[PDB]
Amino acid sequence: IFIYQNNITPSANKMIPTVSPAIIETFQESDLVVNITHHELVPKHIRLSDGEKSQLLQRYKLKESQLPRIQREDPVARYLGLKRGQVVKIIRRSETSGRYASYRICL
Amino acid sequence: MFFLKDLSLILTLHPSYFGPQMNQYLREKLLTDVEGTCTGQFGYIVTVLDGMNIDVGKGRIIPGSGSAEFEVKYRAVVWKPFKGEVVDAIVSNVSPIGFFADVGPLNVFVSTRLIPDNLVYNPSNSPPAYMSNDELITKGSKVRLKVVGTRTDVNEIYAIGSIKEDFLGAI
Amino acid sequence: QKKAMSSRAGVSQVLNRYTYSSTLSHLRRTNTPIGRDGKLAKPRQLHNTHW
Amino acid sequence: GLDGTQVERQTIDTIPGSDKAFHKRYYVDLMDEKNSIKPDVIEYAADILGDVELQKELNSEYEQLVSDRKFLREIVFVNGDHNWPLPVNLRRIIQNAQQIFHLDRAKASDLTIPEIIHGVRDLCKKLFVLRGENELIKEAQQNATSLFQCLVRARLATRRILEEFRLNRDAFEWVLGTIEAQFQRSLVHPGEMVGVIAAQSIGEPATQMNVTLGVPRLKEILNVAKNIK
Amino acid sequence: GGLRFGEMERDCMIAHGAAGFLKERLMEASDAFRVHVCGICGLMSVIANLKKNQFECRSCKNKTNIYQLHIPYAAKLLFQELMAMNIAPRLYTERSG
Amino acid sequence: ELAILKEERTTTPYLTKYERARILGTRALQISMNAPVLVDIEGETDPLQIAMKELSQRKIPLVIRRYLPDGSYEDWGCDELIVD
Amino acid sequence: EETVEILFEAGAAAELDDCRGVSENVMLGQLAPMGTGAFDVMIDEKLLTSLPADYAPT
Amino acid sequence: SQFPYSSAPLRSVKEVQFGLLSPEEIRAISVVKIEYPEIMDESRQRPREGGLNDPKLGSIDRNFKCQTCGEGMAECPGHFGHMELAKPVFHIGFIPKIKKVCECICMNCGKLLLDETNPTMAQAIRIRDPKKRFNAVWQLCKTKMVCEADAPKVVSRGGCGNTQPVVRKDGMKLWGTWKKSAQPERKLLTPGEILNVFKHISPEDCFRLGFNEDYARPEWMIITVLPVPPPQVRPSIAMDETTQGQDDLTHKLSDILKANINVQKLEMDGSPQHIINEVEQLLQFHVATYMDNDIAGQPQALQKSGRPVKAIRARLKGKEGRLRGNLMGKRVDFSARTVISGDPNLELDQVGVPISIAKTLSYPETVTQYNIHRLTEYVRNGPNEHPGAKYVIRDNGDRIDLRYHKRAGDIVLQYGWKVERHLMDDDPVLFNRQPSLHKMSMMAHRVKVMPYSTFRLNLSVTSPYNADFDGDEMNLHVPQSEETRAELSQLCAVPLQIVSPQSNKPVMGIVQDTLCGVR
Amino acid sequence: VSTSTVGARRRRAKQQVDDEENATLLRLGPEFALKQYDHDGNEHDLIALSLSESRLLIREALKARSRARNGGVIDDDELAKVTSGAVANGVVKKTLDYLNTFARFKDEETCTAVDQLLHLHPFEIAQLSSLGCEDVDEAITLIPSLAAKKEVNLQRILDELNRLEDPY
RNA sequence: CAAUAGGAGCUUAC
DNA sequence: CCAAACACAAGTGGACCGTAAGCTCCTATTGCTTTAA
DNA sequence: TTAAAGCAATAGGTCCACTTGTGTTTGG
Ligand SMILES: [Mg+2]
Ligand SMILES: [Zn+2]
Ligand SMILES: [Zn+2]
After folding, report:
1. Nearest CA-CA partner of H372 in H405, H424, H421, H407
2. Who contacts D146 (Cβ-Cβ below 8 Å, separation ≥6)?
3. Count of other CB atoms within 10 angstroms of residue C3
4. Which of H154, H148, H165, H158 lies closest to H113, judged by CA?
5. Shortest alpha-carbon distance between residue F41 and chain B (Å)
6. CATH of B1-82, one of 1.20.1600.10, 3.20.20.70, 3.40.50.1100, 3.30.1490.120
7. Where would a tag sit more exposed on chain D, N or C end, judged by fewer CB atoms within 10 A?
8. For B50, which DSSP code?
């Protein structure tokens, strides 16, 4: 994780994905001042494991492309270090049922 | 030549026939319907292996008409000729312009120009037949004859052979 | 006649003879050719100067 | 998982009030003589006092009620609102049960506490929005009916059932069976065109309608705008 | 003339879930038609002689794999106009992938 | 291949409104096409009402095949789904 | 919307239409996989074979 | 059942596969080559074969049959011809994509400007969607201005090394600017040269840009032979009992034929290069406006009445076009309309139907052994008395009209036959008021036959319809089968819509005098 | 009407000259693919039946359907009767008499023996059980494809075949 | 046993 | 500091605008030149 | 000298996408 201050230039930015097998993510300090997962409108995201993702797909008789989706650049996917194909589980308030579990897959 | 062929036949059933021994009625309908028919894509359907034990499955009611559709899948035996394949036969007819030989369910006729020239026809022999010195073609004979043509007509097909080639003709 | 498009339509109309007052009103009618292509509700409004 | 014609506004009774009011409505004590069931309502009144193998079940019930209170107050309805559209109307069920079985004359009730507790527990484990032995199926099923279970447990509490509604065993079995069947009737049917119904349900009110509101604001929302008025 | 069963009437029938009624309004109460398609090319280029019981797609040189379809006459006309603009709509009666 | 065994059938055990409507329509069309009638016909001559009597007595011989979004399906005879 | 442009793009890219929607089944006059058309109605044999043997096809 | 028997099995469309039509298949499916412009022979009775009204194209007359399929007007679909063009022309609906492909590919050797060597394109290839893949390859490959022969020892990728032009669009003419090395010589790209360049694209190259080998080949976006639609798509009409004008498409095809022949009068004799371009461009413009007469920045193909030509695109779009005017909604039989009135004495799910409408509309009731007496009474009653019947349908589709039949007493009804009896009490009918804003604006009612030509409604159902009785009219749709009767009565019936899902409250109440009176 | 596992065969842009039949050159048609399928779509080896297996199968099917018709209770001219229709009886009688006029293997025992011995392309596999041949010459000239496979073994296989051939 | 099309204009009920 | 590779912003494009219904009225190519009787 | 048939000829405001030009980074 490479926390920077002002900006990361695209020429530098292109080296970020070409450094396999390590992973480099960057955040700007101004963005990190508030932790957004503590916000009341942001429910708790929990990345699933591979076995649990397989269980989720089989329980619903689903393909990966038939799930609601989340961008890798989503602030909470960025905050969680989500890689492509990983599924978060989002438990949230429900005024009709009390509790509702949502799942989104990463683009 | 005979091939074992998996084939199907979609059917329509009136609601009036919806009784307790329906499936056997459809089996009898299949046996009457298919035992004898020709199709240009398969050949000739002589019999059906295990006729009484075909599975009709579950039919679906067509919306708007009320008649049932069945995909009665089964494995049967079909007989199809191919040009350039050798097929045995027995002669049925005789004529100055050639003779007819029954092949499988069909009857094959060979023309005069496609016959070894040592064979000579005779309208006056008893019995009337083609002859030669050391070759004979009379009624009841066997003929190992090649197929060199097959036109596909939906109901009845016809194959025209040629006995002009070696190892062929009277046997 | 050959320029029917780009020409004003409905400038002449069949005189309404259903009843007498309908005729009298048809003879005193007015039309602003703004057109219905456009949802500006301002020119459709009864205005003070209409008095 | 419910069809939108089948739900009616109902009060969730564990939400409102002070802790003292909550305690007085719902908490029972077996050893304590005064704060127990009023003796003149049940057949088995004298056998109740002093027991322990039943005060355990009463405490479990009260702790489940406190769990519901905390859940609804802190997660679901943080602002205190307790009148929400929900499936089967239980006031009407209770009043119909009173009418059919003639609950007058304040008769000695033959409805034991353990039977009440186990009846409500089984009912809470009988409301099927999703069927299957899978584990995500079980989790989704329990998340689906959490609010409705909160309602059913806030209403069918032991003190309330025995004192305020005075149901006997027959009325109790009838209320439970009716809750099963009417909840099974409140579910949306597979095949519903909920998208067309929702589109019409949203568009029709627009025909009757310095913050921007009404049709221009709805147009801004649906025509997702990078800037708004 | 007849009354227009417009788009909003179709929306209301869809909300009601009455699929058979919608199909019956749009087909048997209106321009229902029958066309023959080629089982190989899926174009309505099948030459049909119903009294002689003979069919042929001359492009595919086909006489056995031909299917009939009941479709709105307006749909047949739409497909023919698309063919007139070199677009080939191919109607297939079975899924492959 | 795509059929589901009668044990792991995870759909509702209750006949839905659309299934009931279509089943009644199809049965009415069948009886109106001189199909045999399983119930005892006492008074009524309308094929739809006869179909309703048969449906209530669980004597309508039809099957609902409930397709899942992935193409698989479950089979339920009408007589084993519960009608309200 | 954009009917002609969308049809041209579908032609130029060889789009395959799976015919699972509502409108697509509407324009072809077919039963939509919707409401009453979201299932199929088969013929049950186990219940049928209980009938009297005289109600049979001849 | 109103279709004569065909032996093929009837099935329904599960998959639609769009795509272009190749010239080979266009020639193959055709039935007659079209070359003579003039419509009639010489105004001479069964016009010139090889013209736009060749009987091979099909029949549009009631007492004549199709010379191609031998079927009546009812069954003959119409048959396509073809009309070879002297020069190839652009398909008007593909010029932007032709330009994009021209920018993407090497215009000399038919190869992609960049390979999988460059990892950006090596990953842009990896998109499954044809359109996203095409966009991701064009957004990169469009800027390299040479077909490098070496992939970035000397290893040759097979490239050529020719520079790339800067494509631009001005109307229907594709300009390509070659900036040599100063003066960039800008030349016109004709449809034929682009067609030749496009035929050279290899199958795998074709796959990378997102096209298809079997269905959509990039050169099939250039027209070289034109299909001629049957006269069904462009039928003639009669104005005053003896006169006929051809449809717009027919005159447009005639103009195209004139243009084609004028093109074939230039490459056969003197043509000083300022007539070849003019006449070929006339052909291009006629072909373009035959398909799309709404092209920006040019005049429209006009009629001698001053109106523009009704192009096919204009045929297909809009509220009144094919899709929304004939497919999303259409006019239907077995419907009625009249003013509505209120009746306090009707039940909630009852509608009062005028006698005249009850006799004009009809329901087909299959004859069975439970309704044969009643149906024979209806047949004897006739189509002028209620309850009667209008038609008898035999088991093969033959209609017995009971008006002109003088011997209505001598009809015995067979089993399985069908009688199209009158509208009768308790029939479920769909009843509807526009606009139909929600599912409860169109509901199924039970019929009660009444005099006095208005429709009668119980007054509590006027709220879901938003109706009142000061001029309103409402529509009535009669279901023509048992499936639709059951669907109406079990899903759309008035009692079933009392509670709405919009706000989980009732929509029908007590109104407008019963409320005041009950207070 | 009559269809089978052969389904779409959809139209690719290109055609194929290799579509005409020539039974001398192993070209049979797009109905006898080198790897067949079954009625469950599962893969399955092509079937090319000699006269013996087919005769046994047809006799078996006819007698099974006769026992089924009889409730559970000898000659081709009679055994072909089980079909329905005069044309059916005629075609099956001619086929069965053709089988019994050229059936060198008149039992299941020798059919099983040749099945074991043979199991190479099933076409020629069945044609060897169908076409009696003295030496290598008849096989390699009447069946011209045995040349370019370099696994012949025709000598001893044919020897044992004609040895197992019953008298007549 | 067979009753044109396209336009414009004025209106009806929301 | 002059060069290639590459990104962002601005301007000029296009497409669409409730539903259903009724009636009446007008127009459906016209004019000029050439050929044949 | 007149009539019929065929061919030719005129003068509303928003948003999104694509293309071109000018600025930034890395560096020969
Ligand atoms: Mg009104
Ligand atoms: Zn074809
Ligand atoms: Zn090149």
Report:
1. H421
2. A97, A98, A99, D71
3. 7
4. H148
5. 17
6. 3.30.1490.120
7. C
8. T
